[PDB]
Symmetry: D3
Subunit: 306 residues, 6 copies
């Protein structure tokens, strides 16, 4: 029987450590595909397909976006994916950071390993592309961010965070688990690109609710901040912008190629990027897609400066 | 009782003077938030929320986009905002050009001053973000462009213009002023991102009608032209392009970071940018968003070369 | 009476030869506007307005996107357009690569020549803008790509291809040719930006069907690949991305201005660009817009690496 | 009767203040041409022609190289030159930092003003070019350094110093002042480019003797150091290098154009340049021209790191 | 019997025409090696070995430096060298602009052709390297400048000039032509690098004497000036500098690689370079090597600004 | 008693292996200071002070320039210097590649280790600076080249070589070893900068004599060649140039900062640099300082292309 948890919100501080090395290495991460029911919005239970990071023998939590992977250019990257036994649909990986870096569909219970070399630096998206239906798998929340830093790592910053944006089309009733009163993917609404809710880090109120990481992204005044951003979509890009903030550096792919002083950057679906800004002003600031009516739909977050 | 004027179209030549100085200064502008009824489209009266520039004791006209602000990097910028006495909803400022450069909601009648230092160069958007509902306030037309030029100013050009694009969702009847037969904002159409009309400089026929600035943007052949462009949205970006024209320089944020020879540039909502092109061909040329069915809806302008 | 052919799919290998010269020249191409009925999707006949390239006395085939034009910066470009006698609506050219490079509407039967100098390098779109209704003419498939290479030509690559993306709004019945059972343009669906099908190179299954250029784009492992890409629209841009591939170079307009290591690039409607990537991984790879539900609608292609 | 002082050594710390402004200004300096007898080397009295800086009503000391002038690009530079009453030969100015920035020969007693605009940034040499014999006038020590910093000034550093290198050809006996037992310029040795002594800051032991600025150039470990360097010549350039030090930045003329990590830089006679290096190692370090036998001849200084 | 002419001074305006083409071509020049007696200095007859340019059937004059060659990058360069019948020593060519671009020693009377492709842009020196003794042949004045401009040519300028610097060691008596009372090369003085005279364009007073090209280099105020400079040596480089002038651009080899705002540039012997400066100041200005005692020896020229 | 060998010529192919790693390491080299008598020129025995590289238990040969050291930026460099027991004067190291990277004078017999971090990339000189008389120690031949390559190493080339230039002042008789008939350093000639011989790699005929490395530097046509060059001096720089060759890249200190297409580059004494060129022409080519009378004095080498 399916697990039913409060939410799949991803902490935007659960980030691997900064890179200060030039020696290539074999970086290795353990992932587990987890089908879960949880609140998408307040009062709305949704059937999620998520990624969870396994450390040692311990696993979870299940989140949207998935766990942030972090490596250096020239490293060898090993992702062990497991498909939980209590899942329904099969799953697999697809890393934009690698050349032909896709796994083969693994059945619930089986576990396979994906090995690939990260030979192009940048922020990339990774996702579930199983059954040749990447649309359906991403739509349910199976997407995360991988960053390949250059040799020596990116310029050091005071605080760093991770945000994944996505849109959701909800149909009441789940085909499986009919006992559960909650929503399932809507093909029609999805095909028509007419979403109901927008989410930052897997929840409509995530980054807006103190209980659900509402004060999670907080920085001291005068700090340099870096933001690893993904647009999971699966259809709508993000006109990303933070109120009262100016992006000193913006690079979608390479550190060297960037625009200075961007206010709002269009991040297309299925793409990741890096934002850099100094927190020169104190107080609360609203993180939002600048398609503003999107914000009421949940494209709304909160940055704190002390 | 509400004022009812023909239109809120903004002259795309009402531009402050070019900057040729390196001495920082305290540049100061007087704004007044003005709720007005006027033609959005021919035969359609709409309830606008606009910005107007006050010179000396004289104010107006009320326009969309709002008045262009123009400063140098390192200047100190002072905006005195006034909320007219005959307004309904409260208002405030939000400048993308400044760090935590937001005012506090001022009530109809009261007047506050916003002081901020412009320490990042570029073209930025400013707007009304009052009542924590920037979507509603921008949707009614409360958006304008500010440019922070580098020290010495941008490279001199023969002719310069100012264009703000926006989309509108209209509901017949205004909740207030029921006597007026005209349209008010539609939450549903707005939330669904399905606009009825598109406008350049606050009117569907603005830049297309000789009476309403139709021949306003005219330049001599062989001239260098610069265009300060804003995408007010509040939801739809602009695939900006001018027929028979090639953009020699395009920079969304910094002068140094630009692409040469762009044909169509995506300007996301809540963003401003600078276009530069030589008028090497004579005659009439259609300024349009390149989502072409948008053009019938009003995303259509006119450039004249003599 | 109208011609009725199986499809208007464009071979993504029918490309002019690479440029290795610095001597400017007068490059000349013969085009013929061809109204045709053909399969848009399997089982759906659509009324197309296309461009065809005339070599010597021989013409055709009629395709979407139109024939790729290819010149050097400083060349003199001569396009002879002919409007077939059995056409209905008038037509003309509009080249984004030239300054005021638009023809005048030519009637079915008449033939005019467009001469222009290509003095800005880059990948550009060209299209039919006749009757002052570029939306209607582009919507029916009258769009192609022109590239102006720098002097010496772009860096040489092993394999090169040409892809035009577009979206379609279909209404059953053609106003003309009522005898034909097939679909015509839908103003309403088009104005609302709610397309039914998406196409790569003029067909929903083109680049997916072995019969219809399905294995057309095939390259040997370790090859450098260049892709000339257009977004015909006429309303929807393309979040272009190829699965298992990383773009080493991406330039929308100038060769010099580009971003390294892009995964997904937003190509706005009415714009063309150049993608460059090494085929370091073997096997099949899905070419798609990353608005993934678009892929089921036909935004789906196939790249083969041996 | 001539003045006879111990030495004309220039303190390499008597430097104007750093520039942190972008507002152009009229910077003004008062100079006085001073013929003096002093020790060139220990036990060798030489007849010097020097420049001295007049502050307020007070003047002196007389030094080689002359006083460092320091301005910003776009400033207006005013140099009042005075030729002392007890001088013999006439004198004038010649600034490499200005376009046609030469005075006219002023007679002993008379005083003229040189006004010029500094519209090209960089480190330049200035000198006495009177009587159309710049060789004779420079040979006697009439040379100094002027730097035109960019707007905003050069990047700030912890410690800054000023060094002028020169070579000397000495003939016993002065034509004038026969009573004095000391040396005068040797035409023959000078014409043959065979100097006897080399000097840093006007003395053979200057920068080597604690009494004569020997510990004058001292910096704390980990400090950033900037060095304003002139090669007075008048015939021999300087293969400038500091032992145990690496120049992180070296620019002869423009800040932007520089080589990173230079060990020894050739500074041609009649040229000035800027060296930048971090003092990462403690202890004493020998400043020298790398024509090493030059060092015994006096091309030898001392840098201290604590 | 040997010819005896007044001087071998080269007009610094006898320059080929500017290049405004990108089409490679086969540029061809006819040279004739001419041994001549003439004034090196006033009252001093010297035995010169020079190059002369043959146009059509007409040849001469014989000059130092030799005739300026001027081509575009990618051209094919053909130099027909002739060794006059009344010469003594054999001669040949050696172009620094070409890969293995050396002729074979041609005997007096015989004529050979040198063909080479100019595939690296820049200013280069060419000279006589015959008998494996390039020192002896260059010492007598057999050196000239070749420039390979990029495709399109260098940026256009108002006025352009050509200057070759050299030093001379003179021995009274010529081994051949004993009847002539004049000077021949001195091995000892030459080997010891102790020259007697310095020359600009083959004469000590050339560029200083109105009769001998003294007012030859004259430009209008506000003009852009370009200078093609060679350092023939054969031993001493030139600390080139023009009084009252600042070099806006200086490139020894490639147009792209240059330093801005140089005052004095060291040009090593056997090297050529390009100087660029605006003539913003009127009047007379002294062109000189900044080894100033060199100027009395003849390293002295004259620039006029009106 | 002193050793007496034929010559101290250094093989310009005895070069450490190319670097293809980014992992910092502790690179370690064993040096031994060796006083030796040998032929400077044919028939002239000179008293040399040289460096020799000790591999394992085996040492020698003794050469000028000393052994080439080769490391990566960020490595830790360990040089064990030994002063042979049969030496007279004490010795020490001085690396331009390190911050305060000087040893203390070690007595004949004693052995010390120099540890330093190479944190600035480039080609540098190292030498003996013992007894505070670097002039005397370098003059006798105690100088070599160290290169700090960037992470990943310099771009790979087909063939690589090592050349050290120097000048010599010789006095007959050695103060020590009076039995030996040969020459010792001349203070006077040295102080006056009037050298007798010039040498490439420690011998006048080295690189010119088949027996003494005359055909040592040989490369196949079409090969890319890199040259690590030092100017030991100790007084005269090198106007380095190779006949029939063009330097595609020239960097004195940093790989990034370089000039393209240099013909002759001035390398000041006490400096090292990197030259890069393609061997597009076959046959013999003369390597020389372009102060051509220097070539007869021994500044003459030989490059072979097959
Ligand atoms: Ca990315
Ligand atoms: Ca902007
Ligand atoms: Ca383009
Ligand atoms: Ca300078
Ligand atoms: Ca050159
Ligand atoms: Ca170096
Ligand atoms: Cu899945
Ligand atoms: Cu993807
Ligand atoms: Cu408002
Ligand atoms: Cu905003
Ligand atoms: Cu048409
Ligand atoms: Cu178009
Ligand atoms: Cu004087
Ligand atoms: Cu000077
Ligand atoms: Cu000759
Ligand atoms: Cu040469
Ligand atoms: Cu020693
Ligand atoms: Cu040294």
């Amino acid at each position: 029987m399916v697990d039913v948890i409060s939410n799949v919100a991803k902490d935007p501080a659960d980030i691997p450590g900064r890179i200060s090395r030039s020696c290539p290495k074999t970086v290795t991460v353990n992932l587990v595909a987890k089908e879960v029911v949880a609140d998408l919005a307040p009062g709305k239970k949704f059937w999620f397909w998520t990624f969870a990071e396994k450390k040692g023998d311990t696993v979870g939590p299940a989140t949207v976006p998935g766990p942030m992977v972090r490596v250096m250019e020239g490293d060898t990257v090993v992702i062990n994916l497991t498909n939980d036994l209590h899942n329904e649909e099969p799953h697999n990986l697809d890393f934009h950071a690698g050349f032909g870096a896709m796994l083969m569909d693994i059945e619930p219970g089986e576990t396979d390993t994906l090995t690939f070399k990260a030979k192009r630096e940048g922020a990339y998206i990774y996702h579930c592309g199983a059954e040749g239906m990447p649309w359906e798998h991403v739509a349910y929340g199976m997407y995360g961010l991988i960053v390949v830093e250059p040799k020596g790592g990116l310029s050091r910053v005071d605080k760093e965070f991770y945000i994944g944006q996505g849109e959701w089309y909800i149909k009441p009733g789940i085909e499986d688990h009919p006992h559960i009163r909650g929503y399932s993917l809507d093909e029609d609404k999805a095909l028509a690109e007419h979403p109901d809710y927008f989410t930052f880090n897997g929840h409509t109120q995530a980054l807006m609710d103190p209980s659900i990481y509402g004060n999670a992204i907080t920085v001291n005044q005068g700090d340099k901040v870096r933001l690893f951003f993904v647009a999971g979509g699966p259809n709508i890009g993000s006109n990303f912008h933070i109120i009262g903030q100016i992006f000193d550096k913006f690079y979608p792919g390479h550190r060297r190629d960037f625009i200075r002083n961007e206010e709002t950057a269009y991040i297309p679906p299925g793409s990741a990027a890096v934002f850099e800004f100094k927190a020169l002003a104190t107080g609360d600031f609203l993180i939002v897609d600048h398609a503003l009516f999107r914000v009421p739909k949940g494209a709304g977050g909160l940055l704190h400066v002390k």
